[PDB]
Amino acid sequence: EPLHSIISSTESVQGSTSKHEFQAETKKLLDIVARSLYSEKEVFIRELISNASDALEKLRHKLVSDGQALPEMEIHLQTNAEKGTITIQDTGIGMTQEELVSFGVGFYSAFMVADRVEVYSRSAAPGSLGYQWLSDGSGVFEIAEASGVRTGTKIIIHLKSDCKEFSSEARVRDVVTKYSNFVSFPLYLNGRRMNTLQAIWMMDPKDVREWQHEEFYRYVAQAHDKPRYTLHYKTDAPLNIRSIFYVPDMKPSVALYSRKVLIQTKATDILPKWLRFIRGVVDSEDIPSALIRKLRDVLQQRLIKFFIDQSKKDAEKYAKFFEDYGLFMREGIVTATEQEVKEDIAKLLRYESSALPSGQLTSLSEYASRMRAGTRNIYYLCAPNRHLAEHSPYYEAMKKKDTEVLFCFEQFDELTLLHLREFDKKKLISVET
Ligand SMILES: COc1c(C)cnc(Cn2ncc3c(Cl)nc(N)nc32)c1C
């Protein structure tokens, strides 16, 4: 029995509770978050845990800053069938009386599942008093000074009668592992440790190394191979982004987190569909799917840039990459409405050339460089193979021309090139006609 629990009845109230009413605002806010805010109730577990994390962080930040030693920082959950209750305690930083009397709105999600909510909290500030807070969700809550309150916050939820399911250990376990696996602080359920995965996307890219990226890749992609490509991308400049993107070793989606808290599974709009082969995670604080598209554009540009930069530091690895995933790139080009989205994506295309040795590939932009004068012509020919292409007469005029011609060997490459009628300021025309 390595049983580890901190949740116990140590709290007592000596005086009477003072009765308060929420302000005309908060009654609506509490009402709403219960009534319409969350699509499925279970997420209350998700919110409270998140709160429990934040508090803990704020404690750890304080102590470490003052050079003080660290106490046990933990999050504990307790289910009870006989009492029909679910409990969540964190020792983190607490709440002063002021804070209790008058993070966000996550807490109030608890009233999606509760007849009444009973809370005990203490601030980590020296010589702080503990307090009890009681609510029916009415508009009436109660505050009293409590004894036997541990530093941090203890929330006791008396589930309403159709929500006794969250009094079951198994159920709550499932919810926890679903949304809360990557919590930053040790999390216990009924005395047992329940979490172990590290939110490596939050780390400094220079601290994350291979074995970790490999583990995480296998987890998020549910795969047994390795990522051939890894992009660890962080920004505050446009929006808040902590992301990791993987390209699988094997030939043929992204999870949406916020603050290490699972928002969505198998999300389809974070990345453009032509990038649906990408695996990994995107974490952002700019979250509630009508307008998530800022992120989509930012990530599309960042990923295109990434691959373009991959083609330079390594030539043949990117050649195999284009061989195995060129499908999605052509598809993306033909799909995109605006022209230069087409062209951005077209910067990833690799084709053989009349100039280069048979077996080597070239991008379009490289093609722009070689041409001397005569802007407004890009020359291409599609044929069964390189040898066949070389013979063809129409090129022959080109061969004594001094102008390079690209070589395609599949109709989908030529169709792609025909759709993308123009690259940069130069037209893509076929040497025959
Ligand atoms: C019942 O009291 C409240 C009310 C009235 C509003 N919001 C919350 C959530 N909340 N707010 C601060 C805070 C801290 Cl420091 N730790 C933890 N775990 N939870 C927190 C509570 C607990």
Swiss-Prot record:
Phosphoserine occurs at which residues? 102
Q: In which tissues is it expressed?
A: Found in skeletal muscle, liver, heart, brain, kidney, pancreas, lung, placenta and bladder. Expression is highly reduced in bladder cancer and renal cell carcinoma specimens compared to healthy tissues, but it is increased in other type of tumors.
Q: Tell me where in or outside the cell this protein is found.
A: Mitochondrion; Mitochondrion inner membrane; Mitochondrion matrix
Q: Which residues carry this modification: N6-acetyllysine?
A: 164, 226, 234, 305, 312, 347
Q: Which residues carry this modification: Phosphothreonine?
A: 375
Q: Which cysteines are cross-linked by disulfides?
A: none
GO biological process entries: chaperone-mediated protein folding; negative regulation of cellular respiration; negative regulation of intrinsic apoptotic signaling pathway in response to hydrogen peroxide; negative regulation of reactive oxygen species biosynthetic process; protein folding; translational attenuation
Gene Ontology CC entries for this record: membrane; mitochondrial inner membrane; mitochondrial intermembrane space; mitochondrial matrix; mitochondrion; nucleoplasm
Quote the record's binding site residues for ATP.
Answer: 51, 90, 107
Q: Does the keyword Protein biosynthesis apply?
A: no
Q: Say yes or no: keyword Cytoplasm present.
A: no
Provide this UniProt record's keywords sorted from A to Z.
Acetylation, ATP-binding, Chaperone, Membrane, Mitochondrion, Mitochondrion inner membrane, Nucleotide-binding, Phosphoprotein, Transit peptide
- Molecular function per GO: ATP binding; ATP hydrolysis activity; ATP-dependent protein folding chaperone; protein kinase binding; RNA binding; tumor necrosis factor receptor binding; unfolded protein binding
Q: What does this protein do?
A: Chaperone that expresses an ATPase activity. Involved in maintaining mitochondrial function and polarization, downstream of PINK1 and mitochondrial complex I. Is a negative regulator of mitochondrial respiration able to modulate the balance between oxidative phosphorylation and aerobic glycolysis. The impact of TRAP1 on mitochondrial respiration is probably mediated by modulation of mitochondrial SRC and inhibition of SDHA.
> Subunit info?
Binds to the intracellular domain of tumor necrosis factor type 1 receptor. Binds to RB1. Interacts with SRC. Interacts with SDHA.
The UniProt similarity line reads: Belongs to the heat shock protein 90 family.
Name of the protein described by the UniProt record? Heat shock protein 75 kDa, mitochondrial
Organism equals: Homo sapiens (Human)
Lineage of origin? Eukaryota, Metazoa, Chordata, Craniata, Vertebrata
Name the encoding gene, please: TRAP1
